[PDB]
Symmetry: C3
Subunit: 446 residues, 3 copies
């Protein structure tokens, strides 16, 4: 085998994470240029990280099975929050079955009544918060509130929402996030030591599990028709003929809510931010034309089948600013990538950021252009690819499209600074800088 070339080891401890939090794109482009190779290795905290930064080789990265490019070792930071024996922390066979059970709950087939539930919360929100003829809001925080409120209406039954509302859900997820050390992907030794915040999060999730249990007992003693997410997952049956444990169900619900909270929020925000920008009026007008073709009450078919332009807007906002900068796996057995082999124990990564800004794939990559197409097949990896592709993608897109169509139909927006906000690359999920997201809404003439 030929090893990819290697950026030589630097002295500050985890110093490359600082660069990755400040200018990740430029850092990776430098690595690529200096070593004259799209496939290259860096060393972070003693751990080799090999980045497939050539769009043409995406298939090598996304094809292999979890047994061989495993996500388990790279997501050890998440075990306290989701639970032992849940998702990435489960043996491979159970892992695959659990993920699939969640994927089954979020198929287009399961979305009956979701668009009206979403429209209802959004309208409730706009009437509570956007009351005036005119007013100033933080668009990032309000999208975030709408994402959690709308997800909770779609996924959880009324009895569940009565005991556990979106605000409590939001707090719990936010507390959990605050307990993580994202750098510890490169500090596996740390995660073997006792961490107090870890015990705290497990009690928090155990409290959630208690609520969930009480709900099931109450539903079981009043029935004659549990087709919400909780209900669906409790009815799943593994290949061996057993059921998921409530522990496992609770964990998968947390993971689903945790996954969508920032990614979908960010995507909504960027999309709305580009569309209200004056130099994009042409695309806004185009969006209104599409929306006005439709009544007030939307449905699944309108949003998902009959809004191709709104789709290009959302996709191109994920293209330009992907909220997850890296997809990563642990190499469990060595793998070929072009003329190279990437050895076992390496972390192998593919970067939606680096790849969405490749000039060959996306000519003039700093331009937000909803009409563009990829020049390289598979270079859009906003939701990953292959067999492990985002299983929440259709649910996320339904939410974002519905919120977009409801909001722009009822309100005009103006960004209260000249340029679109800069991404803030310091956070785990990357989105627009919070203090640059002030916007003025104006209620449209009824």
């Amino acid at each position: 085998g030929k090893l990819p070339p290697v950026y030589p080891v630097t002295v500050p401890f985890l110093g490359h994470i600082v660069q990755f939090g400040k200018n990740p794109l430029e850092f990776m482009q430098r690595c690529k240029r200096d070593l004259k190779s799209g496939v290259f290795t860096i060393s972070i905290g003693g751990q080799r990280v090999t980045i497939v930064g050539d769009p043409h080789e995406h298939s090598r990265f996304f094809s292999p099975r979890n047994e061989i490019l495993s996500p388990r070792e790279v997501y050890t930071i998440m075990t306290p929050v989701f639970g032992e024996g849940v998702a990435y922390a489960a043996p491979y066979p159970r892992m695959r079955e659990q993920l699939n059970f969640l994927a089954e709950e979020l198929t287009i087939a399961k979305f009956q009544n979701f668009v009206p539930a979403i429209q209802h919360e959004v309208r409730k929100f706009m009437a509570e918060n956007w009351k005036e003829d005119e007013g100033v809001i933080n668009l990032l925080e309000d999208c975030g509130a709408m994402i959690i409120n709308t997800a909770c209406q779609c996924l959880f039954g009324e009895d569940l929402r009565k005991r556990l509302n979106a605000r409590h859900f939001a707090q719990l997820l936010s507390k959990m996030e605050s307990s993580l050390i994202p750098a510890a992907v490169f500090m596996p030794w740390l995660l073997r030591l006792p961490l107090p915040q870890s015990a705290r999060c497990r009690e928090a999730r155990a409290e959630l599990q208690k609520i969930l249990g009480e709900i099931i007992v109450a539903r079981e003693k009043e029935e004659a028709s549990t087709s919400d997410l909780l209900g669906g997952l409790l009815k799943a049956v593994y290949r061996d003929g057993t059921r998921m444990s409530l522990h496992e169900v609770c964990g998968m619900i947390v993971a689903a809510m945790f996954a969508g909270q920032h990614t979908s929020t960010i995507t909504t925000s960027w999309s709305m931010l580009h569309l209200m920008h004056p130099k994009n009026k042409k695309w806004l007008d185009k969006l209104h034309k599409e929306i006005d073709e439709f009544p007030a009450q939307l449905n699944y078919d309108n949003v998902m089948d009959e809004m191709p332009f709104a789709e290009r807007c959302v996709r191109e906002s994920i293209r330009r600013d992907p909220p997850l900068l890296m997809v990563m796996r642990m190499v469990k057995a060595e793998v070929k990538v072009g003329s190279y082999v990437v050895p076992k124990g390496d972390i192998i990564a593919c970067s939606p950021l680096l790849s969405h800004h490749d000039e060959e794939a996306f000519p003039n990559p700093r331009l937000w252009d909803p009409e563009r197409d990829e020049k390289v097949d598979g270079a859009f990896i906003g939701f990953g690819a292959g067999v492990h592709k985002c299983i929440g993608q259709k649910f996320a897109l339904l939410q974002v499209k519905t919120i977009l169509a409801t909001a722009f139909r009822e309100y005009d927006f103006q960004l209260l600074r000249d340029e679109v906000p800069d991404p803030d690359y310091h956070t785990m999920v990357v989105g627009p800088t919070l203090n640059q997201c002030l916007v003025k809404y104006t209620r449209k003439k009824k």
Copy 2:
């Protein structure tokens, strides 16, 4: 409960400590503004830190007992230097009794002969080091030398000083400080691992303990009158009727000397730095008027009761540049703070820096103005507040005021750069940048 809002988690490991060491004020003001709340939470190394940045809520932070906002877990870094079973490392009841025994040794009631002892060392120092009609000194280092020399004359008997002089004391404290990892407040897992520097410091303190023991044996075999600090503490009796161990006494002496070495030094320096600045001549003239009302030999009453203006100068230098930027505690049981609850396991903090620069409390907070008053009651927290307030405050103020009155009576000073020195926020105790503290003394016409 409602959780305070949370700055979302950042990727560089302990990256917020870098900002806290470079621009802490601006970092915290940003957190406050971006989240629209004076009470807010950040995550450092996986550990939630909730900052009470509203001056009006100081009472919630400073009221609770050590059983419930505990200092023990946040000061684990200090256990090697002070000893197991000493101070913050003692069970709560013993902790309280030990701290109180030290507080009792440093009451105004115990200061007979301190002002003359201080004046004597300062005069000895000025005659050894400031010999000429005119000359250049580093004011920060010389204040530091005067603080340790004067503390040793007040607190330790001649026999003790003969075996352990201020220079040796200074070295030992300085060696101990060099062994600490202040960031490990956010790395409790680290402090459970063996650290070699920790064993070294304990041998150093054990050597100190040996000297102290020999002194006691020598005093016990020559007496007919141990009213120094060592003597006082050895005579303390716990509620159960036993005595502190020599181990515990030794530890409390170290902690007392360690506490005052930089804080008091820094406060002296800032005070002298502002007063010699030309735009402050008006306050200098005012200070001389007050000093000239008094003979050469001062006494307790002059310094502590009859120098109200010198007091405003020292207080306002602590206001403008508090040497401890944060008071912190571990939440052992949850607590209310305004409309929020701060959960167990959080670190809860209140910042004298952030609070002394609040515009409502201290209008035009960058101005050093000794005549100002707080506009918010309890917003001055230079020495903390409540039941856990600095127990060295009266001793520190006596030293600083005495040094100020002795030095300015005998010398004029001029700062050898245009602007007052910038604080250097990189160190544990924060003071003026060392290389900006060059000053020229001029011996006054006798």
Copy 3:
């Protein structure tokens, strides 16, 4: 004892390593100036580091035996790569004997046929890569390739090179380097925890050991004349009458190749970079005069005895940019350094960088001047000094001088930017910034 003075402890974890990776010279000069002492102590991660930054006191640092200023504890990071019981990881007596056995293999006495072997590889390389009349290359990478290719021809027999060629060797060393955490010199607690990359490197070296074993078995079953490095080391006999183990031999070969890969490469590059710079034409002309005094085929005597000017060029490039910025040891028993004592447990360091830029020793230290002499005796410490001085120095100098003489005889070079490249201080071995090393070769008129 008097302790050296101490820069007071800073809050960011390992924050001084960031400064050391960005501007080490300025950082250390600041420490020296601010504390008014050439001998001074900083605290990194809780570990005191005392730097002998006075050229006049070099002898204190370099005299003491390994039992008392030990390299073992500071080079724990290297144990996985070289092996347990090898070099710095061996008990002191074995350590001394092993190092000596390697030193014996690299004495001038052992270099018969090295200059022709080197000239042969360099010429092979130039003909493969520098084929045209004219062309653009990265001088740093090509010197690196020449250093490893030429070392392998000198040190390893044909049978060994047939199974393990320079490219495979280069990869293996590069993989090993990528597994290190240089900051962990200041994190001894980390190196006591399991690190996965450590197990990987040991398997890699075990694979190398297997190849080496097979070679020995094959040589042992075909002989009638193992005078390469492998052969030499296998014939070494300890004081007790036993032989090195193949494990130990394998480890010492790795350490030798690892030591020379960047240091010698960097030194070649800098030397060539200065000599092709136009303002240095005067020294280039001088170098050609010396080279032209000699045939095409060089020999040991020409290179090592008859090239005094080429020697000054190489030495002065190591003077101006020493590839190892610090020589460090663990104080095992306390030691005097001027008016100070440096206690046990301190890391004591001497910096070739700081010392080669001292204005007293090297007037106008930013000027590359091959005719200069030190103004302070022992201030050149590019290869260390004393009893522990670099044991590869004569081999490194032979390689560098031979490559210099062969290349400049056959080619002209031009740097494709105006100024000599900046050093990149981020890496373990420090050399010229990689992307500033583009050069244009021109084949000379035959």
